[PDB]
Amino acid sequence: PYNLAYKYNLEYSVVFNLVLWIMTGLALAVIITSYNIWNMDPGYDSIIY
Amino acid sequence: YTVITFPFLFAVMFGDFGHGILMTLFAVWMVLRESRILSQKNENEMFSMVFSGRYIILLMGLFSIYTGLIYNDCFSKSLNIFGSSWSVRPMFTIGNWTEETLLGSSVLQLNPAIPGVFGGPYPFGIDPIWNIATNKLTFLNSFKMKMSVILGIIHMLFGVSLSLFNHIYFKKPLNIYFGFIPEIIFMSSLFGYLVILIFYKWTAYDAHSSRNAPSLLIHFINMFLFSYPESGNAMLYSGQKGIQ
Amino acid sequence: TGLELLYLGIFVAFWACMIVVGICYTIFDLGFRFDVAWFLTETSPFMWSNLGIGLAISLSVVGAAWGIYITGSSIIGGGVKAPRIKTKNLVSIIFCEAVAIYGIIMAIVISNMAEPFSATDPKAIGHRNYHAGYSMFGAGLTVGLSNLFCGVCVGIVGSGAALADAQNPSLFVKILIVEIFGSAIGLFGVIVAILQTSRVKMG
Amino acid sequence: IHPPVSYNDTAPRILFWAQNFSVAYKDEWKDLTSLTFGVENLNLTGSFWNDSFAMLSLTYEPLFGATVTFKFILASRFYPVSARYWFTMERLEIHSNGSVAHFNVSQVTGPSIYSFHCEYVSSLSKKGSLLVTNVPSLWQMTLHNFQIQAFNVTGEQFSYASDCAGFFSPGIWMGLLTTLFMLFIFTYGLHMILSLKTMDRFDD
Amino acid sequence: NNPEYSSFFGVMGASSAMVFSAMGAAYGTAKSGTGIAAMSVMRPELIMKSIIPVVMAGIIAIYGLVVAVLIANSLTDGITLYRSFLQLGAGLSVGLSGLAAGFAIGIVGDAGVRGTAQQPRLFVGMILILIFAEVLGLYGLIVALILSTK
Amino acid sequence: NNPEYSSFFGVMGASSAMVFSAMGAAYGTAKSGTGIAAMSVMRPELIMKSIIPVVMAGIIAIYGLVVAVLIANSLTDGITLYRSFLQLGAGLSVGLSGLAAGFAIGIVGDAGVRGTAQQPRLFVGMILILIFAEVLGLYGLIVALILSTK
Amino acid sequence: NNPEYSSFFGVMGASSAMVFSAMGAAYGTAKSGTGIAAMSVMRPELIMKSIIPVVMAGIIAIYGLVVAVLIANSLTDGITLYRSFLQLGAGLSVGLSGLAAGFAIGIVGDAGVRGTAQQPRLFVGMILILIFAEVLGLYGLIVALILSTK
Amino acid sequence: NNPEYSSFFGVMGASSAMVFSAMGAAYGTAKSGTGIAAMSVMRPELIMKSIIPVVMAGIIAIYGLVVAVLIANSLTDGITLYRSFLQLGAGLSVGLSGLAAGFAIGIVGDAGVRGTAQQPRLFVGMILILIFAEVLGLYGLIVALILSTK
Amino acid sequence: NNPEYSSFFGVMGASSAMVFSAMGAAYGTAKSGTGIAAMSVMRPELIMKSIIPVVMAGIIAIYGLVVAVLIANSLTDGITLYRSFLQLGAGLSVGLSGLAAGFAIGIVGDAGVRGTAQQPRLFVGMILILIFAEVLGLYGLIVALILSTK
Amino acid sequence: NNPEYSSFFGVMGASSAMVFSAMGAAYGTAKSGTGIAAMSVMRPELIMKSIIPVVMAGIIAIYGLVVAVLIANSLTDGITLYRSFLQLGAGLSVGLSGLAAGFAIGIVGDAGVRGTAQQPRLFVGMILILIFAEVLGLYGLIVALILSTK
Amino acid sequence: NNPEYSSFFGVMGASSAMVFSAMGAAYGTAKSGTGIAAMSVMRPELIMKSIIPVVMAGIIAIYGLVVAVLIANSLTDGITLYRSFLQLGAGLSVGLSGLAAGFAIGIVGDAGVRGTAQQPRLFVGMILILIFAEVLGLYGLIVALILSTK
Amino acid sequence: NTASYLRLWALSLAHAQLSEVLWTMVIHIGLHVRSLAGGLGLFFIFAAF
Ligand SMILES: *[C@@H]1O[C@H](CO)[C@@H](O[C@@H]2O[C@H](CO)[C@@H](O)[C@H](O)[C@H]2NC(C)=O)[C@H](O)[C@H]1NC(C)=O
Ligand SMILES: *[C@@H]1O[C@H](CO)[C@@H](O[C@@H]2O[C@H](CO)[C@@H](O)[C@H](O)[C@H]2NC(C)=O)[C@H](O)[C@H]1NC(C)=O
Ligand SMILES: *[C@@H]1O[C@H](CO)[C@@H](O[C@@H]2O[C@H](CO)[C@@H](O)[C@H](O)[C@H]2NC(C)=O)[C@H](O)[C@H]1NC(C)=O
Ligand SMILES: *[C@@H]1O[C@H](CO)[C@@H](O[C@@H]2O[C@H](CO)[C@@H](O)[C@H](O)[C@H]2NC(C)=O)[C@H](O)[C@H]1NC(C)=O
């Protein structure tokens, strides 16, 4: 390189924002439903013992 | 004392002509049938309340009819009786806003709203042109708020004034000369001034009289608040500062 | 309590990300990129004005709703044995509703100072407009929050007084002063909301 | 690969570089990348440097049958906000047949010490509306990966690049704030509706 | 000069105006239905007597729908970004007003339904309290309408 | 100028409509099924009569479908970024209104089906309250049909 | 030219189209398992007839499989950022619809299975409700198709 | 000359000085009123001599109003971005001092009102603590007043 | 040119696949072991036939390993960011599917093992549900294959 | 030469100092008042002899006000972006130390007043333990001084 | 050159060193105070010997003050930003170690005061376990000192 | 009470807008061209009105 240029960036705003927000939305959905299925209540009636 | 002027016969503020005639028709049919209705068994407690209220229902229907007539909004559609005022040809030919037959349908979509040589109110109510317009919301809002202020102030004034007779009947001159005179004085000095200002704004201007800017709507109803500390500018007619 | 856990997790994660990005920005001598001025400038003042109006009316109305329901449940519960309280106590209810009114008229006054722009650049075009937009947004937030909070206080006090009336009906007059104090506090909020947007030019 | 153009009357002062610098007159596209970067000699007559000004002039005698001249104007001054010097591109001028067409740059600015870089510098809306003017003209120019430095420049190499791509755009930030308020209201409603239960047993 | 993405704010204003009012009406309907089901086990004749909280929630939903329809019909391609923010503000205001109104409607309707199941004389008084709830939502509507022009 | 990344908004709107309607219908169906299972232990001969509420919940799901279909026939790469916002708003409105309707219909259906198991006289009032919930969902659909076309 | 990262969306859609639905099915199966734990101890003779919820969950998993496989083979490096967004939306919608359908399947199956341990006559109603929830998942797949072909 | 957006921080400071002071006042008044309404049933002869905590809770709002009015009157479009920061800091300080003072006033008023309801002789001691709580509030006033003009 | 940090995405995809498969298998075997320990005092002689859920949960690890191997083999510096995205998506999908299989296997194993301790004849019915959960993980694997060599 | 927005850090440092000292003092006064009211039901004489924690909260408020006014008197337009950070650090340190000391004072007073009501000889411990907690806050003051006057 | 501005990091480190140690000491004092108040009701003669945790919390606060004054004495405008990072590291380490020591001594003293109410022989036992607490704190001190004068 | 007197006017505005929107949403749809198709179903639409 004859001169220390930039990283030749792209339309960072739209792609970065949309990707970050869809990533966090999908991750939040996954963790919330996995937490809901984590604490499934069988009932723990007298049948258990 | 109240009956009609009570907040139970101006208990419509929704008169749509047709709605008033419907209420009156229902109440009149029910009053015509009250004999067999009381003779027969009751249906439900709500029907019992309606039966107790039939008279008020009918008379409120009459007042709703009158309020719909003055509002000139029959099923939200206005009524044209004995002229409508306004026009378009004088506004465009004299006002140089002509040649908008298809240009007005291509260039000036919903643009034209200017008074030229016009004026003159509906002899009875509100012109149907205000209904079929699109500035209906602003004009109706201002008109209804001002009607609000005047009606409420006169009503509360009458309510307080009745107490003077109420107390002079029960002797008690100390309260009359010391307790209710201050109430009326304060109420008048704070609200009758607003009413008089509203009427003065209504009467002391015209279409071609807005200050510099085209319309300004009202521009003086609210900037004269309940304290108006200083400055203000705008409308400062001589003596208003001293009276305030 | 899962919802509380989720809200706390989002809160702590966002604040940790914010502090870490701030420390990274200040460490990497990249302060000029984190430009608050550009954010407050290139953002349209119309959003600030309209959001202020919407919050000014909405916070007021939802605080009034909080008050009216928190007192109506109390009234209906305490009115089974004594039906006479079903209406006489209503004098402490309208306060909350009147509190909501203190929004709409306010929501008019600020909305009375809205004009279009027909301008895009921020250099010397919009300085007074910037001040007007920010001031009216602040006034709207002030009135909305104060009105909501006074509404909830008045509703709480009204429920307490209504349950007090269920045993001795002669203490309502002696206890009416607290809720009118709360309504006066709401009146202070509306007064400062008036004063904040008193002298502002928009255009 | 191509070395950047360097106005260095006494020392490296103006550094400019691109990839596909192209110009169209009355919609006649032509590339000048090799005609400005490959060839060492260049008609830099009128090039000017200053402690606060930088007018870079590039002249082409046989372009469009006339000596077409491009003038880039750069200015820097001490902004009171941070007591630091900020440089800002002002305008570009196109001189041809005596006619002087004008083009205004939109947000090309940064700290004076560093060097600016952007992806697309063009007047065409599709490839970024970075160049705009009220009066239409026949000049449509594009610059790909445009990098420039004017002040506090040392050596033949570019300094650190304060790129203008940006994490957030004003529209994206306004939309994000609106959606954040909507999400606040919606999640308050969802939390309060989710905290409702049902009867277990009735009276009889 | 028309900025891009201008209709975005108005679109979500309409969407919020519809959705928040819908959620408030749904919550009110659910709470009042639970109250009615609880009360009907001992006073069967009083079912249609106090079904009105459901129609009150329907009224709040109607306010949301009318505001949304007006905003959508006011939508054009070239929004000057001054109208769009007005529409968004009105929509958010009326939506949260409808949400709060539905909240109060549901809670007070359930309470009053239980009371009128227990004490028959308490209904009419409950009426007043309940009606006030709608007024709050109503305010949103009117503060939207003035916001539709100025 | 036909900017890119514009169809994403409309696609997200259609997907949001579909998922939100689906979740509302699922919640309503789950609540109705829990109610009928809890009540059928005593009076199982009227389970056919009590099948009505969940059907209405399923109707909500059908709602979402049509909106999605309206997006599918109106999807093209060349979207001016103004129509895509309209499609997203319509989808979000119908989906979230359907979600609220599903919440209300599930809660009211469960409570009232248990009540009918305890008292048959509730049944008629059933087909009133639930209708409002369904009507609530229909309200959202209207907005969608206004916003999807324009 | 062509965004090289566009494929990131499309493959992600496939991922979604596999996970959520399957996870939902899992939940359903899991919940149904609890019912089987509380039913075979009373009367295990009809244990064969109590496998409806698990096979509905398997059908949901099959829906996830077919949509994921379709979006997978339709994926290519030469996409135009339009097909990628469309596929991502279809996958997200079908996956979350399958998740909701599986949640409803599990809840209804468990409640009805616990109920039927003493009242067999509910079983027929089972199928109808089950079908509805299964039909719910069907809608998801439908929209996926209506996005894939266009 | 003067930087733009410089009134944003000043107006935010005034808004905070109002909101936080009013919220402290409202919560203190609410807690004290709850306590006094609870106690009034057992000994209605001391209700008048127990409004002092409510008076103090209300009076914190008057210092909040003093600061807000002063810094709103001093505010103008042409603020030097330094006076704006001073006013914002003063407003935040007074608002949060009102926060703390109002919470302390409310809780101590509730506890002392109950104590006076059972033990009358506590009342006088009660009053002392109240003053100390306001020792907080007005102190915040100071850290704004001398800060506002300097 | 070839964009860098594509091996970043591929490596994270393989790592996530292994991580989530391991987590799902661990949770499944944890619940299965809890159920086995609970049931052991009931019928100690039936421990052998009750390890099927344990091994079934443990199988998830082999899909995890095979996907990790299939990704690591394709790992190289010269990847055009498209193969890397495909591998990342495949890894995430298979890992989350194995996680779902682990949850389902663990829950159903615990419940059914307690039941089969209470009543024997459930045993064969056991494997049915387990096999379904098993094939659920299988789904991920096959889609991973379609997403591996593509 | 001197950048603006430098007074920003100083003003918020002073405001935070005053605010957090206020929060600590309010917490201390609140807990002390609650404890005194709880213990005053049986022993009315010890009320005047057990208000020491309130005085400690007051003196912590005194220290907070003193340091805040010291920062306020040392604030000027020509702040050099070096002294301002010292003001911010000193204010934050003193305010947060005061908050912690006030919380400790409040809880220890709440315990100690009840203990003294039960044990008449515990009051001696007061005249030591509180002071230790109290001097903690004093410690913060000193560093603030050595961080402000520098 | 003075890159960026090291004074910010210096003051933040000093403030953190003060506040975290103060908070840990306050928590320890709170736990010791509630323990001693609880134990005073039974064995008032052992109150004097039970104040050891309070004194050690005061010692922790003394260590925090000493390290804060030492680390802020070296603060100067002309700092090369390296000594500033040493400043911040030393302050954070000592403050957080003091907080941990205070947490530990708080629980240890509470439990030991519980135990000593019946068994006086436990008292000397405290002098072992408790001592390690401040040793931990002392440990932080030393890692600050080497950092302070590195 | 001066402020509270403003209440009935909100009902007035809301009733006017409700009537106008109901008209423009039902009757305006019901009256159009192709008279046979525009009036064969007018009975149902008007009954809904
Ligand atoms: C001004 O810039 C030119 C262009 O870079 C310099 O020309 C030199 O050309 C030789 C040819 O091999 C190369 O070393 C470089 O391209 C240039 N050298 C340097 C040091 O830049 C020219 O020398 C520069 N003049 C000054 C005074 O620096
Ligand atoms: C700079 O970009 C221009 C515009 O694309 C290029 O000009 C055209 O390039 C295409 C490439 O497919 C050719 O088919 C055309 O014939 C070119 N038109 C011309 C030269 O008038 C140009 O080649 C690019 N230059 C560089 C160095 O990349
Ligand atoms: C270099 O900077 C000097 C400033 O030190 C410039 O002098 C002024 O520039 C402005 C901007 O065009 C003119 O309006 C003034 O008239 C100039 N001053 C005088 C006394 O003429 C100068 O123009 C800059 N450029 C050059 C080439 O010197
Ligand atoms: C500058 O002026 C000259 C005048 O000759 C232009 O040259 C002619 O331009 C016209 C149209 O622009 C062509 O049709 C002719 O072929 C050109 N040559 C001659 C001899 O007439 C030239 O194009 C102008 N340059 C610009 C940039 O406008």
Care to describe what's here?
This is part of a larger assembly, with one copy of chain A (49 residues), two copies of chain B, one copy of chain C (203 residues), one copy of chain D (204 residues) and seven copies of chain E (150 residues). By secondary structure, chain A is mainly alpha-helical. Chain A contains one helix and no strands. Chain A is rod-shaped. By secondary structure, chain C is an all-alpha fold. Chain C has eight helices and no strands. Chain C starts with a helix and ends in a 7-residue tail after the last helix. In chain D, strands 5, 6, 7, 8, 9, 10 and 12 form a seven-stranded antiparallel β-sheet that branches. In chain D, strands 1, 2, 3, 4, 11 and 13 form a six-stranded antiparallel β-sheet that branches. Chain E contains four helices and no strands. Chain E starts with 6 loop residues before the first helix and ends with a helix. Classes of the chains: A mainly alpha (49), B mainly alpha (244), C mainly alpha (203), D alpha+beta (204), E mainly alpha (150). Chain B binds chain L through residues 13-14, 16, 73, 75-77, 140-141, 144-145, 147-149, 151-153, 155-156, 191, and chain L through 1-2, 5-6, 8-9, 11-13, 15-16, 19-20, 22-23. The PDB classes it as membrane protein.
Which features does this protein show?
part of a larger assembly, 12 chains, A: 49 residues, mainly alpha, B: 244 residues, binds a molecule of 2 linked components (NAG-NAG), membrane protein, Vo sector of V-ATPase
Task: Give the overall shape of chain B.
Answer: flat
How many distinct beta strands of chain D? 13
- The span between the termini of chain D is 90 Å
Structural class given helices, strands, pairing of chain D? alpha+beta
Main location (chain C): membrane
Domain V-ATPase proteolipid subunit C-like (chain C): 51-110, 137-195
Organism (chain C): Rattus norvegicus
Family (chain C): Belongs to the V-ATPase proteolipid subunit family.
In short:
The structure is cut from a larger assembly and holds one copy of chain A (49 residues), two copies of chain B, one copy of chain C (203 residues), one copy of chain D (204 residues) and seven copies of chain E (150 residues). With 244 residues, chain B is mostly helical. Helix content of chain B is 52%, strand content 0%.
Fold blueprint:
The structure is cut from a larger assembly and holds 1 copy of chain A (49 residues), 2 copies of chain B, 1 copy of chain C (203 residues), 1 copy of chain D (204 residues) and 7 copies of chain E (150 residues).
Chain A: H1 12-38
Chain C: H1 2-27, H2 36-42, H3 45-78, H4 85-88, H5 94-111, H6 127-165, H7 172-175, H8 177-196
Chain E: H1 7-39, H2 52-73, H3 83-118, H4 123-147
Helix pairs in contact in E: 1-2, 1-3, 2-3, 2-4, 3-4
The structure holds a molecule of 2 linked components (NAG-NAG) (4 copies).
Family (chain D): Belongs to the vacuolar ATPase subunit S1 family.
Transmembrane segments (chain D): 166-186
Protein name (chain D): V-type proton ATPase subunit S1
